[PDB]
Design a protein around this ligand. Structure first.
Ligand SMILES: [Br-]
Lengths: 29, 27, 29, 28, 28, 29
Protein backbone atom coordinates (compact mmCIF):
# COMPACT_ATOMS: atom_id res chain seq x y z
CA UNK A 1 0.00 0.00 0.00
CA UNK A 2 0.86 3.67 -0.45
CA UNK A 3 0.47 4.47 3.25
CA UNK A 4 2.98 1.68 3.94
CA UNK A 5 5.41 3.16 1.41
CA UNK A 6 4.96 6.52 3.14
CA UNK A 7 5.97 4.99 6.47
CA UNK A 8 8.99 3.38 4.71
CA UNK A 9 10.30 6.72 3.50
CA UNK A 10 9.74 8.23 6.93
CA UNK A 11 11.74 5.34 8.35
CA UNK A 12 14.68 5.89 6.03
CA UNK A 13 14.57 9.58 6.90
CA UNK A 14 14.69 8.84 10.62
CA UNK A 15 17.85 6.74 10.27
CA UNK A 16 19.68 9.29 8.16
CA UNK A 17 18.83 11.72 10.97
CA UNK A 18 19.98 9.08 13.44
CA UNK A 19 23.38 9.01 11.71
CA UNK A 20 23.83 12.77 11.55
CA UNK A 21 22.87 13.00 15.23
CA UNK A 22 25.67 10.54 15.86
CA UNK A 23 28.22 12.53 13.85
CA UNK A 24 27.46 15.62 15.94
CA UNK A 25 27.88 13.53 19.09
CA UNK A 26 31.16 12.05 17.88
CA UNK A 27 32.39 15.41 16.60
CA UNK A 28 31.77 16.66 20.14
CA UNK A 29 34.62 14.35 21.16
CA UNK B 1 -2.77 0.82 11.60
CA UNK B 2 -0.52 2.37 9.00
CA UNK B 3 -1.36 5.90 10.19
CA UNK B 4 -0.31 5.02 13.71
CA UNK B 5 2.90 3.69 12.23
CA UNK B 6 3.42 6.88 10.26
CA UNK B 7 3.06 8.83 13.50
CA UNK B 8 5.69 6.55 15.14
CA UNK B 9 8.25 7.35 12.48
CA UNK B 10 7.58 11.07 12.91
CA UNK B 11 8.09 10.56 16.64
CA UNK B 12 11.46 8.93 15.98
CA UNK B 13 12.27 11.81 13.66
CA UNK B 14 11.60 14.50 16.32
CA UNK B 15 13.73 12.42 18.70
CA UNK B 16 16.77 12.58 16.36
CA UNK B 17 16.23 16.27 15.63
CA UNK B 18 16.19 16.86 19.38
CA UNK B 19 19.48 15.03 19.74
CA UNK B 20 20.83 17.16 16.91
CA UNK B 21 19.58 20.42 18.44
CA UNK B 22 21.45 19.50 21.61
CA UNK B 23 24.75 18.55 19.99
CA UNK B 24 24.63 22.00 18.39
CA UNK B 25 23.97 23.53 21.80
CA UNK B 26 26.90 21.33 22.82
CA UNK B 27 29.27 22.77 20.18
CA UNK C 1 -7.41 10.89 16.03
CA UNK C 2 -4.46 9.52 14.06
CA UNK C 3 -4.25 12.53 11.72
CA UNK C 4 -4.06 14.77 14.80
CA UNK C 5 -1.25 12.59 16.16
CA UNK C 6 0.61 13.13 12.88
CA UNK C 7 0.02 16.91 13.02
CA UNK C 8 1.28 16.96 16.61
CA UNK C 9 4.52 15.22 15.76
CA UNK C 10 5.04 17.64 12.91
CA UNK C 11 4.61 20.51 15.38
CA UNK C 12 7.31 18.98 17.55
CA UNK C 13 9.48 18.54 14.48
CA UNK C 14 9.01 22.17 13.45
CA UNK C 15 10.05 23.14 16.98
CA UNK C 16 13.37 21.26 16.97
CA UNK C 17 14.23 22.75 13.59
CA UNK C 18 13.53 26.12 15.21
CA UNK C 19 16.03 25.39 17.99
CA UNK C 20 18.56 24.23 15.41
CA UNK C 21 17.96 27.44 13.46
CA UNK C 22 18.74 29.50 16.53
CA UNK C 23 21.97 27.61 17.28
CA UNK C 24 23.21 28.19 13.73
CA UNK C 25 22.12 31.82 14.01
CA UNK C 26 24.21 31.93 17.19
CA UNK C 27 27.32 30.45 15.59
CA UNK C 28 27.12 33.24 13.00
CA UNK C 29 26.42 36.08 15.44
CA UNK D 1 -9.42 20.13 9.06
CA UNK D 2 -6.68 17.66 9.97
CA UNK D 3 -5.10 17.44 6.54
CA UNK D 4 -4.96 21.22 6.62
CA UNK D 5 -3.23 21.21 10.01
CA UNK D 6 -0.68 18.87 8.48
CA UNK D 7 0.04 21.16 5.54
CA UNK D 8 0.52 24.16 7.84
CA UNK D 9 2.99 22.25 10.02
CA UNK D 10 4.85 21.27 6.84
CA UNK D 11 4.84 24.91 5.79
CA UNK D 12 6.31 25.88 9.15
CA UNK D 13 8.92 23.14 8.73
CA UNK D 14 9.90 24.43 5.30
CA UNK D 15 10.26 27.91 6.80
CA UNK D 16 12.64 26.73 9.54
CA UNK D 17 14.67 24.76 7.01
CA UNK D 18 15.03 27.97 5.03
CA UNK D 19 16.25 29.71 8.19
CA UNK D 20 19.00 27.13 8.69
CA UNK D 21 20.10 27.43 5.06
CA UNK D 22 20.36 31.21 5.39
CA UNK D 23 22.61 30.88 8.44
CA UNK D 24 24.89 28.44 6.61
CA UNK D 25 25.24 30.78 3.64
CA UNK D 26 25.87 33.64 6.04
CA UNK D 27 29.10 32.14 7.40
CA UNK D 28 32.17 33.22 5.42
CA UNK E 1 -6.69 19.05 -2.72
CA UNK E 2 -5.34 18.81 0.80
CA UNK E 3 -3.18 15.84 -0.21
CA UNK E 4 -1.97 17.84 -3.23
CA UNK E 5 -1.12 20.64 -0.83
CA UNK E 6 0.88 18.28 1.39
CA UNK E 7 2.95 17.20 -1.61
CA UNK E 8 3.74 20.85 -2.44
CA UNK E 9 5.00 21.57 1.06
CA UNK E 10 7.05 18.38 0.97
CA UNK E 11 8.43 19.63 -2.33
CA UNK E 12 9.31 22.90 -0.59
CA UNK E 13 10.99 20.92 2.19
CA UNK E 14 13.09 18.99 -0.35
CA UNK E 15 14.13 22.30 -1.90
CA UNK E 16 15.36 23.83 1.36
CA UNK E 17 17.14 20.60 2.20
CA UNK E 18 18.86 20.80 -1.18
CA UNK E 19 20.01 24.34 -0.31
CA UNK E 20 21.52 23.17 2.98
CA UNK E 21 23.49 20.45 1.15
CA UNK E 22 24.74 23.06 -1.31
CA UNK E 23 26.18 25.33 1.39
CA UNK E 24 27.64 22.24 3.06
CA UNK E 25 29.14 21.28 -0.29
CA UNK E 26 30.81 24.69 -0.31
CA UNK E 27 32.42 24.11 3.10
CA UNK E 28 33.41 20.44 2.70
CA UNK F 1 -2.22 9.27 -7.18
CA UNK F 2 -1.78 11.97 -4.56
CA UNK F 3 -0.47 9.48 -1.98
CA UNK F 4 2.17 8.27 -4.44
CA UNK F 5 3.04 11.92 -5.08
CA UNK F 6 3.57 12.36 -1.33
CA UNK F 7 5.67 9.19 -1.07
CA UNK F 8 7.84 10.48 -3.93
CA UNK F 9 8.60 13.82 -2.29
CA UNK F 10 9.55 11.85 0.82
CA UNK F 11 11.92 9.92 -1.37
CA UNK F 12 13.43 13.17 -2.64
CA UNK F 13 13.74 14.40 0.93
CA UNK F 14 15.60 11.26 2.05
CA UNK F 15 18.04 11.80 -0.83
CA UNK F 16 19.05 15.35 0.19
CA UNK F 17 19.30 14.29 3.84
CA UNK F 18 21.57 11.50 2.68
CA UNK F 19 23.76 14.11 0.93
CA UNK F 20 23.86 16.37 3.96
CA UNK F 21 24.65 13.27 6.01
CA UNK F 22 27.66 12.58 3.80
CA UNK F 23 28.70 16.23 4.14
CA UNK F 24 28.93 15.89 7.93
CA UNK F 25 31.00 12.72 7.54
CA UNK F 26 33.51 14.48 5.28
CA UNK F 27 34.01 17.16 7.93
CA UNK F 28 34.38 14.44 10.55
CA UNK F 29 37.30 13.38 8.35
BR1 LIG G 1 22.89 20.73 9.56
Amino acid sequence: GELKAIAQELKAIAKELKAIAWEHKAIAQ
